[PDB]
Write a protein that binds this ligand. Structure first.
Ligand code: ADP
Ligand code: BEF
Ligand code: MG
Length: 743
């Protein structure tokens, strides 16, 4: 058993190394320590101070410098006894303070132990290097083991979910959140690999392969290199792994949320557009290139503006293969693939269209190359296109009259088109995939959510509000859930909100919240950004406690979110909400000779939102998501980024701690710390502590009687612990004191 074979890779890579002895006296120490901030300005920066003396109410310790200081006992951040460094669950910690928590994570990370539990959560810190803990051999060790039986791992929470499903006949969910680059998508892919393996029907299976090939397809079209991650997911996703009554994988379905369409037409410096563009340019066959009027990235406006066309240690040509191979496995025909390619190319050509003026104020196409290129690949009438771009007919109530747009408006229109095409294509892909894997008649499911946690940038826009509104809801669900689950534990053992207000501000109908007001402004063609922001301040400024009207800025507003205050900039919200496309453009494309192209514009499912705004739509998708989640038994994973530099072996204190504060980890410890944080199995207590009392023997039947014995020996406050049917519950700091007692 690799599990009890101290020489196995399991032991080397997932466990804290065990020596020849386990004796209590090993860890004996005379010193006591306290975590302190050497600079009170740097609050997340701590050092360990050794305690020297104590008054009845305060502690006096020695700094690193050799300097002496004092602290109130009630404010002190005591350091846990060394026996606690590296524990697998932060819940076993006696002193539960911020520096203590950070420290356990750190001790673990130093030994490359990236996974740690924190009560209900599985905390996962990005290693930024490969650790061989995801092999088939690793998968087989985790099959059927209880949480406590094995080391923390994504595979373990995945197995727990699976056993619960079979045993309770209840659907399950895994929520994996955290910042960009924290490791969400990596862990998500591990869940799927694990499941496909433990629940798949292979004697060597097709379904299983298809399911596995699904994400690569989506990552090509929805991931991009950003400054925070070379493989950023520019969309949220919910994966439902479907099973039959017997527990075998039977299908799957995918839901996507919020694709960043704007990146297709603009990228920040150093970033890239979606991977596919590069993959196509790099691996199209010489025949494909000519058929697509293809060239180099440098030759395309949508690709030559960031200053970055490739990713280090990444071959777009080689990635292309992988992409195409997945499409093949999944079921896309050569034609369908072909058409996808034409679309991707066409978008590139549209991007090179240059509008010039002079005539007057109207726009003109002196050059017509690119137009022709795109026309061709799209299978549409170039002249129609031209006209639909520069001379859209607009409805003036009675009159349907074609407007002659200036270059700007003409450009912006082409851009809206590109965005419409890309976004529709992505939905088509997802629907396609779902058509192949989705089983109408599934018995049970395990759903995995891979989405960002709270987003707080310099500039926060409409997209960030959507994300933060999602996180307010997820966080609330977490809080409801932990509440029940702690309450249930106390019961089994026989021992003795703010969220809503922010949510209401956002999505309330009466009084109307932010989204309602935005939607209302959305029916007025002539409404502007000022109109809208004036309306928000009118309703909430000095009127809603979660809102803040800035002292000087006239284009922003603040929302107090769970993770802190966020300032939103209103620019372009109206447009974003309406996501407008000229009808003459829709007409142009409706007539495509291309089979997929046509679908993008003729299937209400892909072409239309429902008249629904973008906010309203989102609101609805969130509500269905939440509804499903509410029917599952949830599992929470929090992915943590170690630093903002993408480096291994560099766990930065402030970076980490900020994260732990935003994602709810610290609050749960806070909550937990309040009651009886430590809950030890009677038998286990005795094993270690029998020596402390001139009475008890390590091995006993009446473990409780034993436990009581020691407690009594040491003369411990009956308020410091509660007797449970199986566990002895301990208040914060108590266990540390015991550990601190002499043999
Ligand atoms: N457990 C891990 N082992 C190895 N590399 C990882 C791990 N977690 C994340 N990474 C790395 O960090 C990069 C960012 O991870 P990713 O899953 O894409 O983050 P997220 O989806 O949270 O934005 C990955 O492309 C990979 O290099
Ligand atoms: F960049 Be990660 F996908 F949030
Ligand atoms: Mg991702």
């Amino acid at each position: 058993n690799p599990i009890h074979d101290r020489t196995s890779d399991y032991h080397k890579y997932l466990k804290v190394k065990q020596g020849d002895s386990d004796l209590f006296k090993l860890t004996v120490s005379d010193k006591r320590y306290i975590w302190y901030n050497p600079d009170p300005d740097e609050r997340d920066s701590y050092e360990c101070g050794e305690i020297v003396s104590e008054t009845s109410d305060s502690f006096t310790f020695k700094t690193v410098d050799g300097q002496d200081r004092q602290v109130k006992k009630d404010d002190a951040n005591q350091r846990n006894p060394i026996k606690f460094d590296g524990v697998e669950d932060m819940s076993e910690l006696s002193y539960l303070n911020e520096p203590a928590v950070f420290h356990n994570l750190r001790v673990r990370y130093n030994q490359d132990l990236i996974y740690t539990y924190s009560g209900l959560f599985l905390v996962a810190v990005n290693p930024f290097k490969r650790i061989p803990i995801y092999t088939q051999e690793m998968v087989d060790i985790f099959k059927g083991r209880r949480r406590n039986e094995v080391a923390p791992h994504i595979f373990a929470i995945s197995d727990v979910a699976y056993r619960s499903m079979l045993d309770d006949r209840q659907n399950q969910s895994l929520l994996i959140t955290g910042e960009s680059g924290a490791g969400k998508t990596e862990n998500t892919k591990k869940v799927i690999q694990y499941l496909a393996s433990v629940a798949g029907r292979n004697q060597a299976g097709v379904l299983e392969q298809q399911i596995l090939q699904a994400n690569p397809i989506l990552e090509a079209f929805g991931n991009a290199k950003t400054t925070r991650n070379n493989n950023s997911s520019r969309f949220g996703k919910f994966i439902e792994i479907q099973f039959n009554n017997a527990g075998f994988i039977s299908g799957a379905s995918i839901q996507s949320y919020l694709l960043e369409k704007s990146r297709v037409v603009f990228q920040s410096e150093t970033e890239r557009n979606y991977h596919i563009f590069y993959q196509l340019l790099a691996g199209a066959t010489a025949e494909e290139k000519k058929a697509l009027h293809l060239a180099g990235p440098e030759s395309f406006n949508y690709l030559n503006q960031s200053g970055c066309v490739d990713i280090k240690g990444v071959s777009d040509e080689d990635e292309f293969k992988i992409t195409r191979q997945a499409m093949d496995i999944v079921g896309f025909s050569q034609e369908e693939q072909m058409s996808i390619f034409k679309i991707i190319a066409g978008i590139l050509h549209l991007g090179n269209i240059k509008f010039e003026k002079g005539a007057g104020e109207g726009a003109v196409l002196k050059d017509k190359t690119a137009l022709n290129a795109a026309s061709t690949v799209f299978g549409v009438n170039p002249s129609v296109l031209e006209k639909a771009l520069m001379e859209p007919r607009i409805l003036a109530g009675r009159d349907l009259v074609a407007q002659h747009l200036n270059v700007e408006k003409s450009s912006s229109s082409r851009d809206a088109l590109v965005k419409a095409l890309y976004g529709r294509l992505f939905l088509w892909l997802v629907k396609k995939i779902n058509n192949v894997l989705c089983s109408e008649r599934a018995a049970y499911f395990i759903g995995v959510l891979d989405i960002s946690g709270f987003e707080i940038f310099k500039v926060n826009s409409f997209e960030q509000l959507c994300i933060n509104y999602t996180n307010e809801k997820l966080q609330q669900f977490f809080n409801h859930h932990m509440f029940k689950v702690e309450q249930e534990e106390y019961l089994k053992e026989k021992i003795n909100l703010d969220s809503q207000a922010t949510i209401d501000l956002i999505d309330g109908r009466q009084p109307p919240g932010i989204l309602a007001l935005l939607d209302e402004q959305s029916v007025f063609p002539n409404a502007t950004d000022n109109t809208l922001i004036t309306k928000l301040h009118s309703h909430f400024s000095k009127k809603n406690a979660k809102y803040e009207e800035p002292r000087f800025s006239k284009t922003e507003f603040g929302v107090t979110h769970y993770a802190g205050q966020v300032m939103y900039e209103i620019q372009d919200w109206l447009e974003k909400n309406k996501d407008p496309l000229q009808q003459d453009l829709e007409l142009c494309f409706k007539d495509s000779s291309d089979n997929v192209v046509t679908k993008l514009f003729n299937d209400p499912n892909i072409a239309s939102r429902a008249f629904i705004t973008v906010a309203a739509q989102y609101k609805e998708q969130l509500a269905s998501l939440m509804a499903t989640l509410e029917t599952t038994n949830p599992h929470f994973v929090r992915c943590i980024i170690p630093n903002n530099k993408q480096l291994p072996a560099k766990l930065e204190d402030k970076v980490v701690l900020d994260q732990l504060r935003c994602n709810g980890v610290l609050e749960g410890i806070r909550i937990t710390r309040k009651g009886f944080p430590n809950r030890i199995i009677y038998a286990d207590f005795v094993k270690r502590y029998y020596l402390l009392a001139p009475n008890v023997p390590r091995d006993a039947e009446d473990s409780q009687k034993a436990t009581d014995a020691v407690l009594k020996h040491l003369n411990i406050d009956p308020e410091q612990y509660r007797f449970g049917i199986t566990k002895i519950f301990f208040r914060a700091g108590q266990l540390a004191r015991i550990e601190e007692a002499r043999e």
